[PDB]
Structure formats: structure tokens, C-alpha cells
Amino acid sequence: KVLRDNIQGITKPAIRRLARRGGVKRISGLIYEETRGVLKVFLENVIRDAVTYTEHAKRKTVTAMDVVYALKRQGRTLYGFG
Amino acid sequence: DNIQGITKPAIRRLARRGGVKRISGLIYEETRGVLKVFLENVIRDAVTYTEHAKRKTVTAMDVVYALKRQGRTLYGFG
Amino acid sequence: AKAKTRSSRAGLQFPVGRVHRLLRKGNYAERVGAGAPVYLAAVLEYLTAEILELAGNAARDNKKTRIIPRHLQLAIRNDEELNKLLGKVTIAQGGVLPNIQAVLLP
Amino acid sequence: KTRSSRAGLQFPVGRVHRLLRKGNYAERVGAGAPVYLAAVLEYLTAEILELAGNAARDNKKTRIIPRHLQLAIRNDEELNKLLGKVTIAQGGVLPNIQAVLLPK
Amino acid sequence: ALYEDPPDQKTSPSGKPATLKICSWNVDGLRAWIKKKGLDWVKEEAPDILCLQETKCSENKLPAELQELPGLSHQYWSAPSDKEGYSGVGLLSRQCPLKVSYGIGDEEHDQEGRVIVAEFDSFVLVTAYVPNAGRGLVRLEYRQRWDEAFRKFLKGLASRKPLVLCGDLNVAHEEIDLRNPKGNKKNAGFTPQERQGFGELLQAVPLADSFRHLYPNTPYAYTFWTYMMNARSKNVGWRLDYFLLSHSLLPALCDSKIRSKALGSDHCPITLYLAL
Amino acid sequence: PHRYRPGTVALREIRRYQKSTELLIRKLPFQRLVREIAQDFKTDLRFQSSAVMALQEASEAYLVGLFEDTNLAAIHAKRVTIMPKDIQLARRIRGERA
Amino acid sequence: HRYRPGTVALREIRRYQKSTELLIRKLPFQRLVREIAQDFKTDLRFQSSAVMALQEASEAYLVGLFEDTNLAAIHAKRVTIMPKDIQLARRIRGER
Amino acid sequence: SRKESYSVYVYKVLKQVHPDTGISSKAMGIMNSFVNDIFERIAGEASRLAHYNKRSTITSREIQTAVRLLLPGELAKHAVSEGTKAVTKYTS
Amino acid sequence: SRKESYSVYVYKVLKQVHPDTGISSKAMGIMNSFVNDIFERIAGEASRLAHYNKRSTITSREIQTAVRLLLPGELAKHAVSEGTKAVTKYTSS
DNA sequence: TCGGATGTATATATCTGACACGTGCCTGGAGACTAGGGAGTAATCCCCTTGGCGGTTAAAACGCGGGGGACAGCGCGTACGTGCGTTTAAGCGGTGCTAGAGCTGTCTACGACCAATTGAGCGGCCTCGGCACCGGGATTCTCG
DNA sequence: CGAGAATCCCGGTGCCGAGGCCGCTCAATTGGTCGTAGACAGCTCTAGCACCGCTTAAACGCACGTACGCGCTGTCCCCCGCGTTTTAACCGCCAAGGGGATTACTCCCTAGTCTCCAGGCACGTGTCAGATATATCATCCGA
């Protein structure tokens, strides 16, 4: 089953809550459309490396370890998974 | 205090290559601190490398290693 | 003979033997010195003790006895030298340190 | 005879293989790994040198200097991604004046 | 913008066919021009006589492309003795001239490499690279003295057989002869002094401007375009290269062409058709 | 009847969501987004729940850092309202787009 | 007869962009490096290539910082570069 | 597949530092990853030092220099002091 | 004693791709540093890939995956294609 | 609208010191043969992911003031650039002089490596106490 | 300044996982050997440092004009706070199947060792690309 039009699933209130946690007080309307692209790009970059890692090991499930290594490649170094 | 050796025209010229048309009167005093901090950061690692190598001559390659550890990779000296 | 572990011999708490085994199997160099695992274990236990002490202080501040990732994340961010050692590291389910810019507050 | 000539390359294969073991990267090194890596390395500089001189021949010179390598790398759109962090000795800088600064 | 030179007229006003084709070209570095394969163009044009200016080449350094063309076999060359790499002129001819000489009176002492005189059966040919007034007019006074000397020299010649003068006369005579007249108010090539010199040349010798005689009101017709600012692309040029003729030769005049498309210099060739 | 002024609720909320440590993004939409992104590279993959949680946490950390940086940029320009050009500035100065 | 303020400044930017020179007097920089390194270890000997490498790295870092800060100042609807802009660029680059 | 994590050792260190403080499983995972990452950094820098100085073994001096390179500020000063004290006690 | 450098091979490649261009000594030193750095990056990534899978060999699979990981899109595709061509060329004879 | 101040495309004449090519030889690469240990293949099973159904409701979507902030426009006055005479220190050229970097010759200590062995550490199973929460009341902020 | 909303506190409840316990490991430790590497002494040449003198490019202090940074005002527009209506997330529940670890076996690829030679690195050297240096408009400012 193939999937379509899922980037809109990251709703406006979710962006508002993330921005509030970041510590902003007033948000312009054209921010939502910018972040749904920024996060898309970041996710595309991480998933490419994760899929490469899982494909090399001749696996078919993206283990959390693969995502951890993909993150570490770009200098993010998530702590708490494996 | 040879941070005074980095003269106002030299800072101005670095800014010009960076592409700045107008410079305020406080950058000259402010950028010397950034430069000093930056050097301290690379001079410490270079001296540590030399001290470990039990030499006392900070060779250029040690400086290259010191830059490479902080991400500022440098080509041309080895 | 009587058996005394190097972890006990050196007066540390981390296992010197496990560090030694990881150093050789890790392919870092074909020869491993005698004192290298001892030195490395001492440094590791020092750093762990420091971060755990700060986390415990933060937890006791919140009137909680247990240490949860939120406490580790405040302990890491509030200190300055730990923060630049772990500048490019994020703690899962750790939250963010509460600073709001003063311009925003009347 | 030489392995590089057998595989139709220019970069050495024996030297790469010697580095691959001496560098202590793994306990065993495969036979095809040096050839693959030598091919990749040759392709990379084939690309850098191909760009660098055009960037030299456009300026009426026949000799490549650091400036031409800096221009060729910065003008590219993915080679810049590959070499974003590196700094080339006296490589100068791309000529880029921001618009406001140019008086309209 | 632009200019298209009209088709070659090859018969005289009285209906006689052209028998003589002369091409003049400031090649601005003969060697370079040959590598710019300027001789391939010459072969296509197949002139009877070829006059070259600003060769910047002493005779010992002429490319072996010298012999390449059998038809132009009588060749005469001149270069300055103490300014090698500047000036230089040449004259190449299908038939052998009766007489050839160099300079305008004292070449043996002031070997300038600017002027060749060749006498043929029915006319005398002079080709010249007139001294530039220079950037900032630094050598304008010299140019004025030289113009006078040249006028007097040519007066003597024209006193016998009819004269054809061709080459780079380094002046745009009137406003119609360059794209930017006031833009060149005091610039070399368009000073009042140089323009007056050209007028006196026409009146004193006397001579007629072949191209302007045939095309008196035609603008945008140039023979030089500055290399800078791609002025050749934009047709921002000047008419600096001429064929000037004795009045007695006007009945022999078929056409005077500007070969705008021929590359290899910052000047283009000009070509004269005469019915002799 | 009683309505708060335009900044009070906004600040109550900075504080609550800067104090707490939940995920802040619904799990199912993010999982579907991750699956859709991953289908363009290798067909018929099978993610693990831990992997999706790790991706979620990394995304939240990245977005919060970006929002903090662009808020600093917006304050620098004598403004309180965050604008897209501020986000572009933050991304440019780090050196991500360019 | 003075050229207007925009004309000479950009005359300088274009020259200083194409040049690939060193732009900093070598002896003052060498003295500064020795003075700073005097602290960590006493009586050091600097190889000349080491000083040259330090100078190259310093020039690159300062030029990059000045670019990033010109963008910061330009965004604030201003052409003059101010110290607040440098401080903002440094904090954003995560270098503070 | 035993995993051999740094759980027991970290728990012992807490009990030493704070005698009456617990630690949850998520915090245990954070501490395990922290320890692994620091160990990897130190070992990698030690190997790089050995290779740079044409050496072939990792003596305690390489570890000391790696610690001095990685840890910023006073942390380096106290880490090297406690490490050398532990080594000195071990030798004798 | 002796210097191990890629000066000869980079000169040969330059001759092959540009038969009439020379290269100065500085640009030569930069092209040596570039090759050394790329070698370090790819070899380190291959070693790490081998370590993760509890495998003790650096074969063509680890190299190709590391090349795919490091290099950006078009460079990755072209490089892996050319490397596969070369390795098949070698194993054929 | 115009007079004066900067880019500015080709071409040739020297100086040079720095690339490009002989060259020779020695050192590392290449060819052969062997052992054996790592890796690929094969079968299994179980547990972990996928999918699908229903109920519940917290959260998202939408509409509507309205008020505060983004933005355009004017003014002003002070900071900066711009040119110029002056001084000052950086190059640049010797010149010497010694710390010490770099290489080589012993060999002794030191770490790799193998045969036992046992105890520190890991897996499965309680179990009671830390902690989230609801229920309620008291406390603090806030805007008209 | 006071009514109303948001927040902290006081406490009983029940829950689930943190911590302890016990059995069973398997790898860390002892005790030996043995090859080698790097510790140490010693030597030679190299280049880093200090000095001196001359040239002159550049840094500096100074006036002056002007332009742009910042403050202020007004306007309008658009984002927030709240209320009402979806609606899709979330929890629980189930089944199902496939693929990810496992053990056994085999085989073939590479490390190791040896001998032999050619290519590539240091060294010399003749040649000429690059650096000037001299000649031969068009366009864009300040007035």
C-alpha cells in the first residue's frame, strides 16, 4: 500500500507547540509552510543513511541502531537507544 | 600585548574580502578578542601534540592536526 | 594462587579487564600497554561520578529521589564545561532548559 | 603484471592495499577493496582536475594554482557539500558582493 | 545599429569591368593574425595586391605561411629599427612593381616602418600606418607634424602618375565615421587636429575618399572596433582604414568595400575594385 | 467575558511546554510521514518502533534548536514576530543550505 | 574630487576579493602567536611553516565570520556592521 | 547474546556518590550511551596519536594526551590527576 | 629517507584529462592532501561498517557502501558505477 | 546634459626561477604455494512487526473580534569614509651561531600468547515502595 | 483595587518496576614462555633565533562633509484568544506471517613466507609560462 500527502499530517498546533518549547512569543503564518519543508529535508537526509545502513547488512527492518548511526554520521549523537 | 599588532587597516581589509561595505568603530576592538580566543583554541592542541611527541618544536603538521580536530581542515601543508 | 581483579587492585570501580578486552578487540592498535586500561577506567569513573553527582543534586532539588533523563539534561546544560563536552549531543526524552528571552517578558 | 594496469587504472593498487593494512582498519582486507577504492580516488581527482583547469583556461593561464582549485570546488554544487569544512591554503574567496551593497 | 556592406559593384560608371582588386588590412600582429588564420580569408578574397599594417614583425620572423600562396609572390616588408613589436607594414602583389621605396623622405635615418610606396604601370600605390595620437593625446603634436610631412611627400608623388593611398590613416574624418562622436571629442582618432589633417590631405594632394564618394550618407560603416566592451559585437566602431584616390582615378572606381565579417584583428579588411 | 491580553497566554505556554518533556507530535502522523519518506529509497521496509521513536526525538531536538536560533535572529532585528526569512538566516549561518 | 562613499568601498571589495594575498602583516602575527603560546609552554621553537599554517587558518576563520555577520547585519535592514551582529553570528554558529 | 552493559558499575558509583538515590532504566540507558561514547572518543584519539607519532602501542601516556585533548578546562586537570593517581597505586 | 606521495599519479591523471595543462607545486600539495583526506574518510567509514556487523574484513561491499554514504548524490552514483566497472574489469582477468 | 576618472582587449621584449623531463638504483611490489579460519549456505522457530476492528475523546479545524505590532515615512545629528602629510615599523639582504631534529646501534624490559581455574557478572523471579493522580482546598496572578 | 482564573499544596490510592536474590556461567586471572620494539645513548647536519642596516609601503593623526542609524509618528493588517464543531489519534484487542537470530557444515580467500625485478623517488638540468612593461575607448560619476 503506497502513501500520499502525509507532510500535512504535521499540523499547525504541533508547530506552535514546538515553537513555544523553543521559546518564541509570536508566530507569523508563513512559518508552518517553511518548517514542513525544513523537517522534510532533514528526515530525507537521515532516512537515506539509515536505509543504506540497513541495506548493507542485508536486512529488511530499520533497527533503531541504524537510525542512531545515521544520526551520528551528521554529528547529532542521540543518547538512549542501544 | 601584540593583539594591538593586528591593526585597524588589517581588520578592515579582512572585512573587505569578507564583503562588508561599512564598518562601525567597535569591531576593531571586538574582533581581536575573537581572534585571540581562536588562536588559544588551536595553540593549546598544537602544544599538547608537540609535548606528547617529546619535541619542543611546534611543527606545521602538528598545527594541521590541531586544526583538523576542531573541524577546520587545512590543505597544503600536509 | 589468590585472585585479585585489577579493578580492585587499582582502587577503581569500573572493570579494568573489560576495558582491556574492548581495547584489543576494538582494533585501535595491535599492542595495548599495561597502564592504558587503568588510566582509561579511572577517567571514565571520574566523569560518570561527576555527571551523576550533578544529576543527583538536580533530582534532590526537585524533591525527587530517582534520576530520570530530565534531571540528567538539566545537569548537563546548566554546567558550562560539561555542556561544551556534550554540545552536539541530545538526550532522548530530556526536554530543554527553561530560559525565555527577557525582551519577550514585559 | 602491476595490479593497477590489469584493472585499467592510474592510481596505484599496491600502495592503497599496503595502506589498507598498515592503517589498522580491519584484521583482514579483501582483494577487490583496493581496486574499488583506487578507482573511486582516481575518479574524484579526475573530476577535480577537470573542473580546476577549465577554471584555469578561462583566465588565459595553462598552470593550475590553489586559486583555480578553490574556484572549481566552490563553483560546484555538490563538491562544495563534500568539501564544505576544508580550507585551501591561500585559495582566496569566491567573488560575491551582496546586493544592497551595490548602490542601485 | 549593425551594418551590412552592400554587394560588390564590379563595373565602372562607364561600364568597364574591374581589372584590379586591392585589399588593405591592419592585422594588429601579423603572426597572431596568421594563427587567427587571416591568410585563409585573404586566399578567398584573392586580391591582386595586399597591403598590411601594424604587422609588428621584422622580415626575418615572417611565418612560412609566406610562401603558402603562389599568386601573391612579390612581397615587400618594412619594420621600425628601434621599436620592434610596433608598427610594421607590408605589400604583396601578383605582378612585380616597377619601383618600391620605404618611408616618407628619410627612412634611411629614421627607419619607422610605416610607409611603402610601389609604382605600377598606371598608378602609384602608397600604403601607410599613420602614427596614433596616443592615449591622452600624448603624441598629438608629433602626429600633426607627421601629417604635414606626409601631405608634402604625397604631393610630390601625385605630381606624376595617379595615386592610390590605402591603409590605417588613424582618423575618423567626420561624425558619420564613428559611432560615438562627442564620446570621442578629444580622443585619438577624432581630435579637430587630426580631422583637419585629413581634410587638408584631400584638398592639397588632392585625393578623394573612395568609400565616402560612393556612399556619402551611409552611417555605421566602420573598420575598427575596440576589443574592450565587445564593441565589435555591438558595432561600436570607427572608420580608420581608407582608400584615397586621385581625382583622375574616379572614372576607374568600381567599388570600395568594408569586409566587416572577416575576423583576426581589431580592424577588418577593406577592398578596392578598379577598372584599369 | 474576561479575556486575557495577547501575550499572557502565549507566555503561559512557553513555560508549560519548556517545563515538560513529552513528544509534542502525534505518533501516527509522524510514523506515516517517516514511512512515506522511506518508500522513495527502498520498497517494502519494516520499521521498528524504537527506530521511529528515535527519529521523532531527533526531529524534535533539531526543530527546537532551529526555532531557538531563529528566535534569537528575530529579536536581533528589533522584532518579536518570527518570520520565514529569519529561519532562512539561521539555516544559512549554520551552513546547511549553503 | 573625492569619490562618493559607495564607489571607493566597493572598489576595495572587488580587489580584496580576487587577491589571494595574506592581508595581515607577518611579523606582528608571528609575535602574537609566540606571546599566546608563551603561556602553555615556555621556550618553544616555532617552525616557519607552522606560523604560516596558523595565519592561513586565522584568515579563513575571520573571513567566514565576517561573511556570516554581513548577512546578519544586512538582514537587520542596515549596512554598517556592528559588534552585536558578530555576537549573534557566533552564538548561532554554536561557537559561544 | 549477553550484552555486558555498564549497569552494575554505574550503579556502584551512584551508591558511592549518593548513598540514598535511585536511578531509572531510561537514565541507565543514557549513562550506558554516555560511557560508550566517551570511551570511543578517547580510544580513537589514542589510536590517532599512536599512528601520528609512528608508534605501535597505546601506553598510558597516549591516554593522558587524549584526555587532555578531549576534556575542556578543569575537567582535563582533574581527570589526568585521578588517572595518574590510579596508575601509580596500581604499579605499586 | 623517502616520501610516499601521489604526485606521479595525479600528474598522469591530469595528462589524461587535460593533455596541455601543467600544475604548480602548491596545487600538487593540495591534490596530495585531498587524496589523503578522502582515503582517510572512506577507509574509516569502511572500518566502522565492518565493526558494526561483527565482521572482520574490508571487502568491496564495505567500500561501496562507505562511498555511497560519504559522497553526495551524483558523485555517489558515478563513483560506484565506475568502481564496479573497474572491479569487474580486474576480476575478469 | 557634459567634462573628468576608472576598467580595459591584444600584442611583443626580457628575467627568472620553477615546472618537466633524463637517470639510476634500490626497495617495495609482484608471482607461487600452503593453512586455516572466516564467511556463505541451509534449515528452523519464534517473536516481533503488520494489519484490521471498535470505542472514546482530546485535539485539530473553523469562525470572529480586536488590539498590538510590522512597516512606511520624516527628521536629525553624530559617526564614519575619504584624502593627505607624517612617522614608523615591516620586508629584505646578509651573517653568524647553536639548540635540537632526525637518524642509527644495542638490548632489556614488556607485551603477545597458551593451559588451567574460578568467581564477578548475567538471566529469571519476586516484592515492596517511589510516584502519578485524582479530590479538594489554599495561594498567587491578572486585567478591567 | 477586587472577582475570577491559573497554580501550588496535602493526602489516600494503587500500580509497576528498581532492586535484591539465586543459580549458572564463561572470561578474567595466574603462571609461565619468547620475540621484538622502543628506551636509551650517541652522533651529524639543519634550520631557528638573534642581530644589523637600508627602503619604503603602510599605519597613523587629523579635518571635513554627509549619509545613514535611530527615534518618533501614524496606519492598517493579521495573529491571538476564545468558542463551537468535527475527526482522526489513541488504546485495547485480536490474528498472522515472515524474517532475524541461531546452529552445522563446508570451502575458498587471504595472511604468511620466499624470491626476483622494475618503477618511482631523489637528483640534475635545459626551457619557457608567468611577471611585468610599453604601446594601440566606453562607460560611469559629480555639477
**What gyration radius of chain H follows from the Cα positions, in whole Å?**
16 Å
Can you tell me the CATH class of chain A?
Answer: Mainly Alpha
- Percent of residues in β-strands of chain A: under 5%
Structural class of chain H: mainly alpha
State the distance separating the first and last CA atoms of chain A. Answer: 31 Å
Largest sheet of chain A: none
Q: Let me know the number of strands of chain A.
A: 2
Shape of chain H: globular
Q: DSSP strand (E) fraction of chain H?
A: under 5%
Order of helices and strands of chain H: HHEHH
Helix content of chain A: 55-70%
Overall structural class of chain A, as computed from helix and strand content, comes to: mainly alpha
- Which series of helices and strands of chain A comes N to C? HEHHE
Tally of DSSP helical segments of chain H: 4
Question: For this structure, what is the CATH class of chain H?
Answer: Mainly Alpha
**How many domains, in number, for the residues of chain A?**
1
Modified residues (Phosphothreonine) (chain G): 42, 69
Modified residues (N6-acetyllysine) (chain G): 18, 41, 77, 84
Modified residues (N6,N6-dimethyllysine) (chain G): 41
Family (chain G): Belongs to the histone H3 family.
What can you see in these coordinates?
The complex is a heterononamer, with 2 copies of chain A, 2 copies of chain C, 1 copy of chain E (276 residues), 2 copies of chain F and 2 copies of chain H. Chain A has 82 residues and is mostly helical. Chain A is built from 3 helices and 2 strands. With 106 residues, chain C is mainly alpha-helical. Chain C has one domain (1-106). Chain E is α+β, with helices and mostly antiparallel strands and 276 residues long. Chain E has one domain. Chain E contains 6 helices and 14 strands. The interface between C and H is large, with 57 and 57 residues. Strand 2 (57-58) of chain B pairs parallel with strand 1 of chain G. Chain E binds a DNA duplex (144 and 143 nucleotides) through loops. The PDB classes it as dna binding protein/dna. Keywords: nucleosome, DNA damage, DNA repair, DNA binding protein, DNA BINDING PROTEIN-DNA complex. It forms an undecameric assembly.
Keywords for this entry:
heterononamer, C: 106 residues, mainly alpha, 2 strands, 52% helix, E: 276 residues, 6-stranded mixed β-sheet, DNA-binding, protein heterodimerization activity (chain H), nucleosome core (chain H), antibiotic (chain H)
